[PDB]
Design a protein around this ligand. Structure first.
Ligand SMILES: CC(=O)CCc1c[nH]c2ccc(OCc3ccccc3)cc12
Length: 210
């Protein structure tokens, strides 16, 4: 019917902002950051069948199929990114979410290659009540050396189509849960392409359904 999402969020937990970036060693003297990917959230979304992408994510325990069976279904999103790979500095990742309620969150980010987990970062964040809403800040988390090395390698490939072949097998799953209750709040699958040089980062957000 309606009650379908218009952005990457639920009624309990909206994404405010996400970005992955690099600030070069000279940012100290004149500031600059490069954004590989970026979502800012300050008509319903299109949907994609989750069965179609199981094989791109880990299986057995905390993999897509069992997370979807566990549910709740309305918390599952797919982000397609066109990443801007055109730039020993600082590689970071910043997320911010908002809720009506006070929770401690667990945020897990699982990097996967050919559908199999390679690295995983798990952080927790207690709420900070601000003007009405609660807010959850995970700003400037350092990027896993895995990704940093991946990026440098990807950057050097001589053809966009090779970058996209390589990225065809590279995925990220973000799972955010209420650390106290264990309830799942947001689950986001990321699939990746490279954008062209002078087009910067873009994205498109889908609901995951079945
Ligand atoms: C501390 C960590 O390592 C967490 C990293 C993380 C969580 N969600 C993400 C979504 C996208 C992303 O990187 C963008 C990218 C990756 C590969 C090629 C081009 C662009 C990184 C992350």
């Amino acid at each position: 019917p309606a009650w379908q999402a218009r952005g990457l969020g639920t009624a309990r937990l909206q994404l405010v902002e996400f970005s992955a970036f690099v600030e070069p060693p000279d940012a100290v003297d004149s500031y600059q950051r490069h954004l590989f990917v970026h979502i800012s959230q300050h008509p319903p979304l299109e949907s994609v069948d989750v069965r179609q992408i199981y094989d791109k994510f880990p299986e057995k325990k905390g993999g897509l199929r069992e997370l979807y069976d566990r549910g709740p279904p309305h918390a599952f999103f797919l982000v397609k990114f066109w990443a801007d790979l055109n730039w020993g500095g600082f590689y970071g990742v910043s997320s911010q979410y908002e809720s009506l309620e006070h929770m401690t969150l667990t945020c897990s980010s699982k990097v996967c290659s050919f559908g199999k987990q390679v690295v995983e970062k798990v952080e927790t964040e207690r709420a900070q009540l601000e003007d009405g809403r609660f807010v959850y800040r995970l700003l400037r988390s350092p990027m896993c050396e895995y990704l940093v090395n991946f990026l440098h390698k990807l950057r050097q490939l001589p053809e966009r189509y090779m970058m996209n072949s390589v990225l065809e097998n590279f995925t990220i799953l973000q799972v955010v849960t209420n650390r106290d209750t264990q309830e799942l709040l947001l689950c986001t699958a990321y699939v990746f392409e490279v954008s062209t040089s002078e087009r910067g980062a873009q994205h498109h957000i889908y609901r995951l359904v079945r």
